[PDB]
Design a protein around this ligand. Structure first.
Ligand SMILES: [Mg+2]
Ligand SMILES: [Mg+2]
Ligand SMILES: [Mg+2]
Ligand SMILES: [Mg+2]
Ligand SMILES: [Mg+2]
Ligand SMILES: [Mg+2]
Ligand SMILES: [Mg+2]
Ligand SMILES: [Mg+2]
Ligand SMILES: [Mg+2]
Ligand SMILES: [Mg+2]
Ligand SMILES: [Mg+2]
Ligand SMILES: [Mg+2]
Ligand SMILES: [Mg+2]
Ligand SMILES: [Mg+2]
Ligand SMILES: [Mg+2]
Ligand SMILES: [Mg+2]
Ligand SMILES: [Mg+2]
Ligand SMILES: [Mg+2]
Ligand SMILES: [Mg+2]
Ligand SMILES: [Mg+2]
Ligand SMILES: [Mg+2]
Ligand SMILES: [Mg+2]
Ligand SMILES: [Mg+2]
Ligand SMILES: [Mg+2]
Ligand SMILES: [Mg+2]
Ligand SMILES: [Mg+2]
Ligand SMILES: [Mg+2]
Ligand SMILES: [Mg+2]
Ligand SMILES: [Mg+2]
Ligand SMILES: [Mg+2]
Ligand SMILES: [Mg+2]
Ligand SMILES: [Mg+2]
Ligand SMILES: [Zn+2]
Lengths: 134, 158, 52, 122, 135, 86, 50
RNA sequence: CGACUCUUAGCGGUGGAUCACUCGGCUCGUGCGUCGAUGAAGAACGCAGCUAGCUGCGAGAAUUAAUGUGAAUUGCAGGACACAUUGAUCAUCGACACUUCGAACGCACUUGCGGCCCCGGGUUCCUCCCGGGGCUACGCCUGUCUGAGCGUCGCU
RNA sequence: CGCCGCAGGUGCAGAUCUUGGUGGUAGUAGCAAAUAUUCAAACGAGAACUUUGAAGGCCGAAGUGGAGAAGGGUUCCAUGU
RNA sequence: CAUCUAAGGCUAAAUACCGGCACGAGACCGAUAGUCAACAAGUACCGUAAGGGAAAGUUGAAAAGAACUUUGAAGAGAGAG
RNA sequence: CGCGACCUCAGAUCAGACGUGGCGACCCGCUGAAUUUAAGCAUAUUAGUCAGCGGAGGAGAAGAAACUAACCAGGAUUCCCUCAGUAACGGCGAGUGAACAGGGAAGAGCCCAGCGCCGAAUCCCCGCCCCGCGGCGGGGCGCGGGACAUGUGGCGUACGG
């Protein structure tokens, strides 16, 4: 279990940190697993969700194999919006349904200089971890 | 109001004692902090005895305790003179000195200077500059024989 | 806060309770009555080699 | 078309004040449009121009201050705003030199009777 | 001596506390002189004082003050101690010689009221109920 | 008449705002605040009112300077230094 | 009264400015919890401090 | 026959108990243990595109810079943002800035009025007006300058 | 939640008990100090009460008039609900 | 006879800590409880002032917060969703 | 009948510094009740406590014996256990009430004045030059000022020198 005396296991404290988390660590909290193909291509398991990458919902009313492109990362509400994941409200317009990023898998990653660097860092740390434990 | 037999009790609780109550819930924390400070201090004085300087052999004052012998504050100046140790060099080599204690008998005086001779024979004196040894000690005698002593230095026994 | 939360037990009694608890841990009826599923255990004072 | 402080720092006092004058004129026109209706594009440009003014002024003040520090470097008396602002108590302390100087008597004690390193056998 | 400052000498209470005259201050007049010198010169530190003369209505003392921030004091050890923040306003805490005499400090059988560092230090230790964890 | 009739006669203010502590306790005719005692150098403060002490104690306001002091203490009050530039 | 000091008039200005209803778009904010301006003041009902 | 009243139950009201929940307390413990004339604590007034309070901030005013991070903020709008002729947001915070009262400091205040030294303008340097900048509190130490005394002296 | 132990801020009808809610009273007492209103029209879903006009009255210049000081602090003034 | 050497001065450690900064924990309380304050709380409000001082948590997984039709001037309804 | 030396005083928006006010849980110096108990009540008790005033620091205060003891003697201060609800105080009523020795936590010692010796050996400020800015120091120079013989510094303090 947990042995660090400077890390809390208090339920009330942990919930306060989660709901009052600043934006830059809300980005870490709102991570998504990668697909099995990407988990093999890169040596990483999970990755913080991004604006323009393509996911598919794995839990809820919108389960399926349809690949939808993320269009909004609403960090304040801890949800993300995806392309065709939407419902028609009363007046006839369509609105997106908030989906927690932990319930999707990133099939394609919106790659830039920062993303490639993070993927290399996560993979390199994993390689060192399995090297130590080998 | 008294009720049948009993003691005449005089509790000293007439003076608002509740505003001065010492709890001891920090006693286990205080013992840990003391033990940590002891270990850190012993690490600070690396080969020197952890407990501290050598204390003299001292008889307890009153008629209740004069059959018993314990450790005193420091060796008197008369003890250091006949043992042949400077009263300012004694502190640097780990001997505690009490300048306000005087010897009244030669039995206690001689017992303490024999104690000083035992300590002086057991002392391993590192040279001040480890590269250049002047008069401290042989390299063999301090190569590994210099270990940090634990407990009181030559504990006083009855 | 000064409710006397702590109790002191005699050392001889604390050692007594250890001996009773160890002696009871060698009787299969007492361990089974704790519900410990010692049914295929080869021997109730179960001793393993020092490699563990 | 924004203003970045990084590219401001090479500029001189003359053009920095010219840029400040241009920004202030633009802000005054934006405040006019704010009270005369205008558009949301001009209303939202108010914050952009306001931060640009602060950016220019910060560059001007930082340049002047660091020039003053370079000017007063090595002089006995500096202006009070150029002196360290540690803490009132920390500024009343004895400095490092006089916290560490000793009497000739204490120097003689340490010369004659220095603390030794020793170990005692059991 | 100290006349009790009550209107018309009325000390509303039990007869034992009816005293107005013949009352005495717990600190000497030399300490009061040191306190008045220190308060006026708040930027200086009282060192000591001594008696220089008296008549029926006045006592005259001379108080030695030190400028803690003068360089002749700062650069000299054996007198740097007065410049430490813990030593400001000694005369208002009874740390000078005159002030200390009124606290009952001393060694041995005559001064058991101040074992602990002060009268209040002794009183707290003797009047605190040590409730251990195991009783 | 001590009741309703006499209440009509009150139109002259005893107290006004205080330029220190901002309370309406500044007695005009005595030129002294009844809450802080403004013309005195020291703030009026009494241990028989702990509730009043915690109404105006340190931390009940803004602490424009103290909140920066606590933040600067975590690095030892360094000055004249900058992070290593990129 | 008509005669007043600058400090009094500035004090009355702030009370006037903050005695206004809350915006309607505040109700649409996330985790709002605010229904209406609870610190509203009417001149006849509640008198100012001064 | 009805009304009315009483009892019981179904349904519906009024009310907000109970239960479940808990970004709050209370208690204990640990490590630090840091304010201020270089202007504190505290107070007032201000600052957002739409903003009243809370929160943040000070005319650079819900923030500037730097560094770390690395695509958001979001209630609506607008608008950047090649994310490598460099960057949204957030965090850190060492640079810069920090209105007026306040120990509060030119004098004074439920108002208001000076003085001195420089600078710019109307003057077209001389001192009137306007504006800007810096000073102008008390106590006290060291030194400096200017002094006082039928205080003690020397030369005269 | 049951059983074996442990520990309590552990059981309410009362205290002119504390806090909150709810009845009968009860559609009851009442909406009775300073003479007084009426007609027509307009707007309006709706008029004893608003607006206009016509009457009849009152304040009767020590006023129910016109202005101020103190105090209030936007109550001032338009538009709308 | 014993014992010290007053009327000058400095000095760390062990010790204290219901204020402060940052943490951890609990056989504690669970919205009339626990801080007065779980919430725009030392706030609203009261008093000339010193000072006194509250009440107030819960839609739902997601606002998907009821489009549209119909009676009414609207509040409010009936359908529908 | 002016000019100087000193003494004692004064002024300055003089050059450079320092104090003020806040917090105040803990700490130091004062001041200081009454409710209460005594089944009344005045001494006593509450209590050297609440309230009041002043002053600090991360701790404060204390502190290296004008000590304890009476022993085969111990040896600065502070804290814990115990001594001890004891010796003692007290309308000897109600009540109050330490210390030494012992065991531990920690442990650390010292500096002046005076008496003396040393050609004031001493210190501050101001300039000029160099080495560095981090808590402003070093080194060199000035027939540069001042302080100081009404006593600065070195040796040296009861453990003797
Ligand atoms: Mg000397
Ligand atoms: Mg009495
Ligand atoms: Mg009356
Ligand atoms: Mg009056
Ligand atoms: Mg009214
Ligand atoms: Mg019901
Ligand atoms: Mg920035
Ligand atoms: Mg006036
Ligand atoms: Mg003369
Ligand atoms: Mg109960
Ligand atoms: Mg009941
Ligand atoms: Mg009726
Ligand atoms: Mg009627
Ligand atoms: Mg008439
Ligand atoms: Mg009129
Ligand atoms: Mg009107
Ligand atoms: Mg409930
Ligand atoms: Mg509550
Ligand atoms: Mg209605
Ligand atoms: Mg000056
Ligand atoms: Mg003070
Ligand atoms: Mg009685
Ligand atoms: Mg009685
Ligand atoms: Mg009585
Ligand atoms: Mg008190
Ligand atoms: Mg001290
Ligand atoms: Mg001392
Ligand atoms: Mg001595
Ligand atoms: Mg006993
Ligand atoms: Mg007593
Ligand atoms: Mg020990
Ligand atoms: Mg000398
Ligand atoms: Zn005030």
């Amino acid at each position: 279990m947990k042995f660090n005396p400077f890390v809390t296991s208090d339920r009330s404290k942990n919930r306060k940190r989660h709901f009052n988390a600043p934006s830059h660590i809300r980005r870490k909290i709102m991570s998504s697993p990668l697909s099995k193909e990407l988990r093999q291509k890169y040596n990483v398991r999970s990755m913080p969700i991004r604006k323009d990458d393509e996911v598919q919902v794995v839990r809820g009313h919108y389960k399926g194999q349809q690949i939808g492109k993320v269009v909004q990362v609403y960090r304040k509400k801890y949800v993300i919006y995806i392309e065709r994941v939407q419902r028609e409200k009363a007046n006839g317009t369509t609105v997106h349904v908030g989906i927690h990023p932990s319930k999707v898998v990133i099939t394609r990653l919106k790659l830039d200089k920062d993303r490639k660097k993070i993927l290399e860092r996560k993979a390199k740390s994993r390689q060192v971890g399995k090297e130590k434990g080998k | 109001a008294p009720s049948r037999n009993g003691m005449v009790l005089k509790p000293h609780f007439h003076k608002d004692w509740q505003r001065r109550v010492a709890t001891w819930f920090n006693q286990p924390a205080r013992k840990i902090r003391r033990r940590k400070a002891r270990q850190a201090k012993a690490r600070r004085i690396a080969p020197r005895p952890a407990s501290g300087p050598i204390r003299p052999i001292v008889r307890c004052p009153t008629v209740r305790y004069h059959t018993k012998v314990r450790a005193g504050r420091g060796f008197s100046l008369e003890e250091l003179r006949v043992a042949g140790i400077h009263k300012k060099v004694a502190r640097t080599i780990g001997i505690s000195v009490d300048p306000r204690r005087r010897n009244k008998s030669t039995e206690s005086l001689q017992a303490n200077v024999q104690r000083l001779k035992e300590y002086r024979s057991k002392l391993i004196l590192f040279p001040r500059k480890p590269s250049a040894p002047k008069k401290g000690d042989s390299s063999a005698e301090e190569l590994k024989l210099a270990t940090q002593l634990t407990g009181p230095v030559m504990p006083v026994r009855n | 806060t000064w409710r006397r939360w702590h109790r002191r037990v005699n050392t001889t009694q604390k050692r007594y309770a250890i001996c009773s608890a160890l002696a009871a841990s060698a009787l299969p009826a007492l361990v089974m009555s704790k519900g410990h599923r010692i049914e295929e255990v080869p021997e109730l004072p179960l001793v393993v080699e020092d490699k563990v | 078309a924004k203003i970045k402080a990084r590219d401001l720092r090479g500029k001189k006092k003359e053009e920095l004040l010219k840029q400040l004058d241009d920004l202030k004129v633009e802000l005054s026109q934006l405040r006019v449009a704010k009270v005369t209706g205008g558009a949301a594009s001009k209303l939202s440009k108010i914050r952009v121009v306001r931060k640009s003014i602060a950016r220019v002024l910060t560059v001007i003040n930082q340049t002047q201050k660091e020039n003053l520090r370079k000017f007063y470097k090595g002089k006995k008396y500096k202006p009070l705003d150029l002196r360290p602002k540690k803490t009132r108590a920390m500024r009343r302390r004895l400095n490092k030199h006089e916290e560490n100087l000793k009497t000739k008597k204490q120097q003689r004690k340490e010369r004659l009777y220095p603390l030794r390193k020793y170990a005692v056998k059991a | 001596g100290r006349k009790r400052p009550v209107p018309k000498g009325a000390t509303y209470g039990k007869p034992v506390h009816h005293g107005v005259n013949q009352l005495k201050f717990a600190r000497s007049l030399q300490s009061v002189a040191e306190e008045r010198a220190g308060r006026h010169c708040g930027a200086l530190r009282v060192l000591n004082s001594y008696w220089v003369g008296e008549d029926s209505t006045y006592k005259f003392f001379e108080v030695i003050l030190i400028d803690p921030f003068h360089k002749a004091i700062r650069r000299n050890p054996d007198t740097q101690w007065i410049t430490k923040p813990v030593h400001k306003h000694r005369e208002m805490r009874g740390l000078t010689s005159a002030g200390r005499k009124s606290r009952g400090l001393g060694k041995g059988h005559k001064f058991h009221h101040t074992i602990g560092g002060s009268r209040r230090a002794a009183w707290r230790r003797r009047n605190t109920l040590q409730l251990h964890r195991y009783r | 008449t001590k009741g309703t009739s006499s209440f009509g006669k009150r139109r002259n203010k005893t107290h006004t705002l205080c330029r220190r502590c901002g309370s309406k306790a500044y007695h005009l005719q005595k030129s002294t605040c009844g809450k802080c005692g403004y013309p005195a150098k020291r703030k009026r403060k009494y241990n028989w009112s702990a509730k009043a002490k915690r109404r105006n104690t340190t931390g009940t306001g803004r602490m424009r300077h103290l909140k920066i002091v606590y933040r600067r203490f975590r690095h030892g009050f360094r000055e004249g230094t900058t992070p290593k530039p990129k | 009264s008509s005669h007043k000091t600058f400090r009094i008039k500035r004090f009355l200005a702030k009370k006037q400015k903050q005695n206004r209803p809350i915006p309607q778009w505040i109700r649409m904010k996330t985790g709002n919890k605010i229904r209406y301006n609870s610190k509203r003041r009417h001149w006849r009902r509640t008198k100012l401090g001064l």
